[PDB]
Amino acid sequence: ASRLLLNNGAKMPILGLGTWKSPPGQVTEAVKVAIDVGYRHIDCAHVYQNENEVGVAIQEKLREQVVKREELFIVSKLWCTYHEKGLVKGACQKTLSDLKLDYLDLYLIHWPTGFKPGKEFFPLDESGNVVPSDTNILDTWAAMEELVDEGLVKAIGISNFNHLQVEMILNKPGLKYKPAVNQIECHPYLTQEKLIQYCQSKGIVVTAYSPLGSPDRPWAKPEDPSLLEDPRIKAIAAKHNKTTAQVLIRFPMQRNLVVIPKSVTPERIAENFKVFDFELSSQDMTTLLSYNRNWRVCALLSCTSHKDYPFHEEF
Amino acid sequence: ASRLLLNNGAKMPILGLGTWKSPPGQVTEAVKVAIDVGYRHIDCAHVYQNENEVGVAIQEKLREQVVKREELFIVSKLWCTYHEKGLVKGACQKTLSDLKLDYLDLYLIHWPTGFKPGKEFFPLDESGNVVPSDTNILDTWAAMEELVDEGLVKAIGISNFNHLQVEMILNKPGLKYKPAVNQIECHPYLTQEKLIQYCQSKGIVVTAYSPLGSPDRPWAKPEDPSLLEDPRIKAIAAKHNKTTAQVLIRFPMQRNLVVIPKSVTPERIAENFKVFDFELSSQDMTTLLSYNRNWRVCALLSCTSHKDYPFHEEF
Numbered sequence: 001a002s003r004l005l006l007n008n009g010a011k012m013p014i015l016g017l018g019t020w021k022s023p024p025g026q027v028t029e030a031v032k033v034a035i036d037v038g039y040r041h042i043d044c045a046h047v048y049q050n051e052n053e054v055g056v057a058i059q060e061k062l063r064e065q066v067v068k069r070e071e072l073f074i075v076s077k078l079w080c081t082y083h084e085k086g087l088v089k090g091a092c093q094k095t096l097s098d099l100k101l102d103y104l105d106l107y108l109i110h111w112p113t114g115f116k117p118g119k120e121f122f123p124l125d126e127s128g129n130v131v132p133s134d135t136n137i138l139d140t141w142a143a144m145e146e147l148v149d150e151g152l153v154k155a156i157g158i159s160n161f162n163h164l165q166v167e168m169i170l171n172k173p174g175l176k177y178k179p180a181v182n183q184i185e186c187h188p189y190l191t192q193e194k195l196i197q198y199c200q201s202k203g204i205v206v207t208a209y210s211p212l213g214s215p216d217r218p219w220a221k222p223e224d225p226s227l228l229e230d231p232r233i234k235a236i237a238a239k240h241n242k243t244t245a246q247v248l249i250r251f252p253m254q255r256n257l258v259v260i261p262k263s264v265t266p267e268r269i270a271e272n273f274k275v276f277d278f279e280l281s282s283q284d285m286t287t288l289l290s291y292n293r294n295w296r297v298c299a300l301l302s303c304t305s306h307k308d309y310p311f312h313e314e315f
Numbered sequence: 316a317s318r319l320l321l322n323n324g325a326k327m328p329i330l331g332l333g334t335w336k337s338p339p340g341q342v343t344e345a346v347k348v349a350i351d352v353g354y355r356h357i358d359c360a361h362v363y364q365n366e367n368e369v370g371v372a373i374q375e376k377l378r379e380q381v382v383k384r385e386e387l388f389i390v391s392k393l394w395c396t397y398h399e400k401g402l403v404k405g406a407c408q409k410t411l412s413d414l415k416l417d418y419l420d421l422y423l424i425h426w427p428t429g430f431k432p433g434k435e436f437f438p439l440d441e442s443g444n445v446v447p448s449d450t451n452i453l454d455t456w457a458a459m460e461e462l463v464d465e466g467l468v469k470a471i472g473i474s475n476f477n478h479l480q481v482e483m484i485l486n487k488p489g490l491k492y493k494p495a496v497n498q499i500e501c502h503p504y505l506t507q508e509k510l511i512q513y514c515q516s517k518g519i520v521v522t523a524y525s526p527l528g529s530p531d532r533p534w535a536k537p538e539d540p541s542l543l544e545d546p547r548i549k550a551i552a553a554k555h556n557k558t559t560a561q562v563l564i565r566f567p568m569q570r571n572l573v574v575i576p577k578s579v580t581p582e583r584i585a586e587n588f589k590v591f592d593f594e595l596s597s598q599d600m601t602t603l604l605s606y607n608r609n610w611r612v613c614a615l616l617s618c619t620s621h622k623d624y625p626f627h628e629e630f
C-alpha cells in the first residue's frame with residue numbers, strides 16, 4: 001500500500017523526504033531529485049530554517065511540469081514559539097509564503113511544549129532551560145482548526161504528543177477537527193508499540209521520524225548506539241540484499257507508518273526509495289521489534305521541566 | 316473509517332447492502348430504502364438472480380436525483396461458469412444490462428472454482444459433485460483486466476480465494492491490475508485472522524460476508540449455532556444498548572474490513588446502518604475474536620473435490 005487514507009479523506013503517501021539538517025544550498029537539489037525519483041511527500045518545518053529553499057525546488061518542478069500541485073503532499077509544522085492563538089495564523093502564512101504555496105496538505109503542532117514568543121526558537125533562561133509560554137494546548141488546537149476553516153491547510157496534526165495529551169485534544173468540548181496524524185520518533189531502539197497502538201485505535205495516522213537514527217543530529221555523542229552500523233541489522237540486510245537503510249525504512253512501513261528518512265545525497269535519496277520490492281519476514285519484524293531500548297534521539301532536553309514535556313509518561 | 320481506499324484510488328464504502336436471497340419481489344424496495352437511509356454500496360452477483368430488480372431501484376433513485384452514479388459503489392461477480400477466458404467479457408456485459416449500468420465499480424471472480432459452461436449455475440455430475448472446466452485462473456484474470464482497459468469496470472477482485480490462490484495472481488508474469496479486494500466469509504465464529512492479515516499486507520481490502528451468520532441460508536439445521544442468539548454476544552450489545560446485528564456489523568469495521576449485511580426489511584436496513592455512533596472496546600474485540608470455531612456458512616460442498624476448492628488450505 002503506497003498511501004494511507006487520512007481523516008480528511010486525503011491520501012497521504014507512505015514515504016516522505018526529511019528536510020531537517022538539509023543545508024539551504026543542498027536541500028534544493030535534494031527536493032528536486034526526490035521528486036524526480038518518485039517522492040511526492042516532503043517533510044518541512046519552520047525551525048529547520050530551509051523551507052524557503054525547499055519551496056524553490058517544488059516551484060522548479062511544477063514549472064518543469066514533472067508534477068501538478070495536487071500530486072505532492074507538503075507537510076510543515078508550527079514552532080513552539082507561535083503557540084499563542086493570535087500568532088498561529090501568521091506563522092502558517094510564513095511557512096506558505098516561504099514554500100511559495102497557497103495551502104499546506106498537513107500542518108502540525110511541532111511540540112506539546114509552547115515557548116516564549118520571540119526571535120529565537122529556543123528562548124533559554126539563566127539555567128539553560130526553555131522560557132515557557134503561557135499557552136495551553138487546547139486554544140492552540142482551536143487556533144489550528146481555524147486554518148482548516150479558512151482553507152489554508154487541508155489537514156491538521158500533532159507531533160510528539162503522548163497519549164494523554166492526544167486524548168485531551170480528542171475530548172476537548174466542541175472539537176471541530178480531529179488530529180490527522182501524530183508524527184513520532186520510531187526505529188528499533190524506540191519501537192513506540194503502545195503509542196502506535198493507541199493512535200491507530202483512535203484512527204490517527206502515525207508518521208515515524210528519525211527512521212535511520214538521525215546520524216547527523218547536532219548533539220550525537222560518539223558513544224551512543226548507531227542503528228546504521230548495528231551488526232544485527234546488517235545481518236538482516238544481508239538476506240534481502242538491501243542496505244541497512246532500506247531495511248530501516250521497510251520496518252515502519254510494514255507496521256503501517258509513514259516514514260520520513262532525511263538525506264541530501266542524490267544517490268541515497270534513490271536508495272531510500274527502493275523499498276517497495278521486498279518484505280521483511282514476520283520474524284524479521286519480530287527481531288527488529290525486540291531491539292527496543294526506549295532510546296530517544298530527539299528528547300528536547302531543554303524542556304524536561306516544562307509543564308507540557310511529553311516524555312515523562314510511559315507513552 | 317467510513318470509506319476505505321482501494322489500490323486504484325477508489326474509496327470503497329465501509330458498509331454495503333447484501334442481496335443474496337432477497338427475492339425479486341422485495342429487492343427493489345430493499346435497495347431504494349437502503350439508498351434513502353444512506354448506503355452507497357450494494358453487493359450483487361449474477362447467481363443471486365435478482366440483479367435486474369436491483370438495477371431498477373438504482374435507475375429509479377438516480378432519476379429522482381437522490382444520488383449520483385458518481386456516489387454509488389455497485390459491485391458484482393463472475394459466475395463459475397464464465398471462467399473460460401472467452402465468456403468473461405459477455406458475462407460482465409450481461410450484468411451491466413440487468414443492473415442497467417454503464418460500468419461497475421468492483422467486479423469480483425465469485426469463486427476460484429470455475430464450472431463447465433452451460434445454462435446451469437451448478438453442473439452436477441452423476442454423484443452430485445459439480446463439473447469443472449479445464450480453464451486457467453490467470454487467464455480468467457486476464458479477461459478481468461481487459462474489462463478495466465475496456466472501461467467496463469473501475470476495479471477488479473476476487474472472492475473466496477485462499478492465500479495460495481491470491482499469491483499466484485500476484486506473481487502472474489506481466490500483471491496489469493492487482494486484486495483490489497478479496498471478499499471472504501467473516502464473523503465471530505470464523506474470525507479469519509491469518510488470511511485477513513495476509514491480505515491487508517498485500518494492500519488487498521477484505522470484505523466480510525455473512526456477517527450475521529446467514530440465518531436465512533437454505534441449508535441451516537437446528538443444531539447449527541446462532542450468532543444473533545449467542546447470549547455472550549447479546550451481552551456486548553446490551554452494554555452498548557445497541558443490538559446484536561449492530562455489534563456484529565461493527566465487529567468487522569474495527570478490523571478494517573468492509574462488511575455487507577443482507578436484509579430486504581426496511582426496518583433492519585435502517586437499523587444496520589446505525590453502527591457508526593459507538594465503539595467496541597479493546598476487550599469486546601478480544602471477546603468476539605475468541606469465539607471462532609472455524610465454522611463456515613458457505614463451503615460450496617458440491618466442490619470439495621474441485622482442483623481449486625479453496626477451503627482445504629489452512630488459509
Ligand SMILES: NC(=O)c1ccc[n+]([C@@H]2O[C@H](COP(=O)([O-])OP(=O)(O)OC[C@H]3O[C@@H](n4cnc5c(N)ncnc54)[C@H](OP(=O)(O)O)[C@@H]3O)[C@@H](O)[C@H]2O)c1
Nearest residue numbers: 018019020209210211212213214216245261262263264265
Ligand atoms: N516532528 C518532529 O518533531 C520531528 C523531529 C525530528 C525529525 N522530524 C522529521 O523526520 C526527518 C527524519 O529524521 P532525521 O533527519 O533526524 O534523521 P534520519 O533520516 O534518521 O537520518 C539522517 C541521516 O542519515 C543519513 N542517510 C539517509 N539516508 C541514508 C542512506 N540510505 N544511507 C546512509 N545514510 C543515509 C543522512 O545523510 P545525508 O543527509 O548526508 O544523505 C543523514 O546523516 C527529519 O528530517 C524531519 O523532517 C520531525
Ligand SMILES: NC(=O)c1ccc[n+]([C@@H]2O[C@H](COP(=O)([O-])OP(=O)(O)OC[C@H]3O[C@@H](n4cnc5c(N)ncnc54)[C@H](OP(=O)(O)O)[C@@H]3O)[C@@H](O)[C@H]2O)c1
Nearest residue numbers: 333334335524525526527528529531560576577578579583
Ligand atoms: N462472495 C460470496 O461468496 C458471498 C457469499 C454469501 C454472501 N455474500 C454477500 O454478503 C451478504 C451478506 O451475507 P448473507 O446474505 O449470507 O447473510 P447475513 O447478512 O449474515 O444475514 C442475512 C440474514 O440476516 C437477517 N438480518 C439482517 N439484518 C438484520 C437485523 N438487523 N436483525 C436481525 N436479522 C437481520 C436477514 O433477514 P431479513 O432479510 O429477513 O431482514 C437474513 O435472514 C449477502 O447478501 C451477499 O450480498 C457474498
Ligand SMILES: NC(=O)[C@@H]1C[C@]2(NC(=O)NC2=O)c2cc(F)ccc2O1
Nearest residue numbers: 020045047048049297298299300301
Ligand atoms: N532536541 C529536540 O528534540 C529537537 C529536535 C528537532 N528536530 C526536529 O525535526 N524537530 C525538532 O524539534 C530540532 C530541530 C531544530 F531545528 C533544532 C533543534 C531541534 O531539537
Ligand SMILES: NC(=O)[C@@H]1C[C@]2(NC(=O)NC2=O)c2cc(F)ccc2O1
Nearest residue numbers: 335362363364425612613614615616
Ligand atoms: N454454498 C455456497 O457456498 C454458495 C453460497 C452463495 N451465496 C453467495 O452469496 N454466493 C454464493 O456463491 C450461493 C448463492 C446462490 F445464489 C446459490 C447458492 C450459493 O451457494
